[PDB]
């Protein structure tokens, strides 16, 4: 009170000095069920992968994507992102994802990169200089390789011009190594562009077949259907907690509600457009949001020339939520309630007054 009044002596009276707050204890985030997962199991762990000149493009959209399972897998020998962060894939949202799956040689795994120049980069699969997304690659020597040689995986070796980014070329036109005319007829200086790899189990690391999946992100004006997973916590009721229900945040006491919502309605508002009712997204139940018991802290004292004894009034606060006496004005701590009636010395409110004789109310 001396701090509030900016004086070392306090006259007899009641002085509102501070503002009691019921501090929030927990944080409750309730988000709906993580269903309709993106089909990453049929892209990363498919039966047969495609070649690199005809890489399979899968469109990931209208689903929730759990990148934490993909990132925490130890089978992947290469996980390099060029436009985003691996730990923020579960937090960001994108419109759609293009998944490009192919098989290359182990020495060409570095060639799927922005600014990298190689045969796979120039003729088989090209990335832009402003590429966003992540390239994931893992060894597949136990599956793709054959003791007689796996010749099913082809790759383009020759083309007149370099690729544009995200461009396919499945054409089988005979390349002209020299300047002799070739009408599709092979000769001394005219060769077929697609050659087969030599994947065998006796080769070391670098010639083994590597399965590569490249995820590319689009951030157009279309809505961001692809988002990360939501980790909803448990629900705690009857306590002043910080609630976060489907992006609607606030602080309040969440109690059971008798308001019967219609099934399309999620939140509830009073006359003054404040959210006082809400539906939990996990379990379809209706909760009332009572605001925490904020109050004004008033100090009841006589003069400091008389005494240093004080009483504290918490306005509009029940005495179980803070010489303790419950009034209609609030909870009064430090005053002994008596049954006698006197003239009003220090007004408390609602017919209650305080006086010094100790402090009585």
Partner 1 sequence: DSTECSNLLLQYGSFCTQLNRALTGIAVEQDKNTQEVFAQVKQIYKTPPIKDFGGFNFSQILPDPSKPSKRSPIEDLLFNKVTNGLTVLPPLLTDEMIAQYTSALLAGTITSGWTFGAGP
Partner 2 sequence: QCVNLTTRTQLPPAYTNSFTRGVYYPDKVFRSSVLHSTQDLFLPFFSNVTWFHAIHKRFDNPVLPFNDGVYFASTEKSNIIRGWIFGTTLDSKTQSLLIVNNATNVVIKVCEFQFCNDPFLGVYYMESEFRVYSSANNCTFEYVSQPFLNFKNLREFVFKNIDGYFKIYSKHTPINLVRDLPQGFSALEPLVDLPIGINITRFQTLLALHRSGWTAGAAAYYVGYLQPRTFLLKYNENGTITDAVDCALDPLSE
- Binding residues for partner 1, rule: CB under 8 A, are 16, 24, 251, 274, 291, 294-296, 315-316, 328-329, 344, 347, 349-351
**C-beta closer to partner 2: residue 69 or 222:** 222
Report the alpha-carbon distance of residue 228 to residue 47 in Å, rounded. 27
Residues contacting residue 223 through CB under 8 Å, at least 6 positions apart: 95
Calculate the dihedral angle through the C-alpha atoms of 85, 89, 92, 94, rounding to the nearest 10 degrees: 110
316 interface partner picked from partner 1, partner 2, ligand NAG, none, CB below 5 to 8 A per type = partner 1
Count of chain residues binding ligand NAG (CB under 6 A): 8
In the three-class reduction of DSSP (H, G, I as helix; E, B as strand; rest coil), residue 286 is classed as strand
State yes or no: residue 183 binds ligand NAG (CB under 6 A).
no
According to DSSP, the residues that pair with 78 across neighbouring strands are 137
**C-beta closer to partner 2: residue 148 or 223:** 223
Give the residue, chosen from 9, 33, 36, 179, that forms a contact with ligand NAG under the rule CB under 6 A: 33
State yes or no: residue 47 binds ligand NAG (CB under 6 A).
no
| Segment holding 43, helix H or strand E | helix 41-44
**C-beta closer to partner 1: residue 268 or 295:** 295
Give min distance, CB of 63 to ligand NAG, in A: 12
Window 222 to 241, contacts with partner 2 (CB under 8 A): 222-223, 225
Residues 15, 5 contacting (CB under 8 angstroms): yes
Give the residue, chosen from 4, 7, 238, 265, that forms a contact with partner 2 under the rule CB under 8 A: 265
Binding mask 287-326 for partner 2 (x = CB under 8 A): ----------------------------------------
State yes or no: residue 277 binds partner 2 (CB under 8 A).
yes
Give min distance, CB of 345 to partner 1, in A: 12
Window 203 to 222, contacts with partner 2 (CB under 8 A): 221-222
State yes or no: residue 267 binds partner 2 (CB under 8 A).
yes
Give min distance, CB of 101 to partner 2, in A: 20
351 interface partner picked from partner 2, ligand NAG, partner 1, none, CB below 5 to 8 A per type = partner 1
Residues 311, 333 contacting (CB under 8 angstroms): yes
Listed residue (83, 202, 80) closest to 138, CA to CA: 80
Helical ranges in 59-168 per DSSP H: 67-71, 119-123
CA 38-43-47 angle, 5° bins: 135
Give min distance, CB of 316 to partner 1, in A: 6
Give the residue, chosen from 161, 283, 305, 341, that forms a contact with ligand NAG under the rule CB under 6 A: 283
**C-beta closer to partner 1: residue 196 or 274:** 274
Residues 316, 324 contacting (CB under 8 angstroms): no
Residues 299, 292 contacting (CB under 8 angstroms): no
44 interface partner picked from partner 1, ligand NAG, partner 2, none, CB below 5 to 8 A per type = ligand NAG
Listed residue (250, 317, 312) closest to 277, CA to CA: 250
State yes or no: residue 262 binds partner 2 (CB under 8 A).
yes
Give min distance, CB of 317 to partner 1, in A: 10
75: tokens are 């089978």
Report the alpha-carbon distance of residue 164 to residue 90 in Å, rounded. 30
| Segment holding 42, helix H or strand E | helix 41-44
Largest distance between two CA atoms of the chain = 122
State yes or no: residue 234 binds ligand NAG (CB under 6 A).
no
Report the alpha-carbon distance of residue 358 to residue 17 in Å, rounded. 21
In the three-class reduction of DSSP (H, G, I as helix; E, B as strand; rest coil), residue 299 is classed as strand
Q: Which residues bind partner 2 (CB under 8 A)?
A: 59, 61-62, 221-223, 225, 259-262, 264-271, 277
């Amino acid at each position: 009170t001396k701090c509030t009044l900016k004086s070392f002596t306090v006259e007899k009276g009641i002085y509102q000095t501070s503002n009691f707050r019921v501090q929030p204890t927990e944080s409750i985030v309730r988000f709906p069920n993580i269903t309709n997962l993106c089909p990453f199991g049929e892209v990363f762990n498919a039966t047969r992968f495609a070649s690199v000149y005809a890489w399979n493009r899968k469109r990931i959209s209208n689903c929730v994507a759990d990148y934490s399972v993909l990132y925490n897998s130890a089978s992947f020998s290469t996980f390099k992102c060029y436009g985003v962060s691996p730990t923020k894939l579960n937090d960001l949202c994108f419109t759609n994802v293009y998944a490009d799956s192919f098989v290359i040689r182990g020495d060409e795994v570095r060639q799927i990169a922005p600014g990298q120049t190689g045969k796979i980069a120039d003729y088989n699969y090209k990335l832009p200089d402003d590429f966003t997304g992540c390239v994931i690659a893992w060894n597949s020597n136990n599956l793709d390789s054959k003791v007689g040689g796996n010749y099913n995986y082809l790759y383009r070796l020759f083309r007149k011009s370099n690729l544009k980014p995200f461009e396919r070329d499945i054409s089988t036109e005979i390349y002209q190594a020299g300047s002799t005319p070739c009408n599709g007829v092979e000769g001394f200086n005219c060769y077929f562009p697609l050659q087969s790899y030599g994947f065998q189990p006796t080769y070391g690391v670098g010639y083994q077949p590597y399965r590569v999946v490249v995820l590319s992100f689009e951030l157009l004006h279309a809505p961001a259907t692809v988002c990360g997973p939501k980790k909803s916590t448990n629900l705690v009721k009857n306590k002043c907690v910080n609630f976060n229900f489907n992006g609607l945040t606030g602080t309040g006491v969440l109690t059971e509600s008798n308001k019967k919502f219609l099934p399309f309605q999620q939140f509830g508002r009073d006359i003054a457009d404040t959210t006082d009712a809400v539906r939990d997204p996990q379990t379809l139940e209706i909760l009332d949001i009572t605001p925490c018991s904020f109050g004004g802290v008033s100090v009841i004292t006589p003069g400091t020339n008389t005494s240093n004894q004080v009483a504290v009034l918490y306005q509009g606060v029940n005495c179980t939520e803070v010489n303790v006496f419950q009034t209609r004005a609030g909870c009064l701590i430090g005053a002994e309630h008596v049954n006698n009636s006197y003239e009003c010395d220090i007004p408390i409110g609602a017919g209650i007054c305080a006086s010094y004789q100790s402090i009585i109310a």
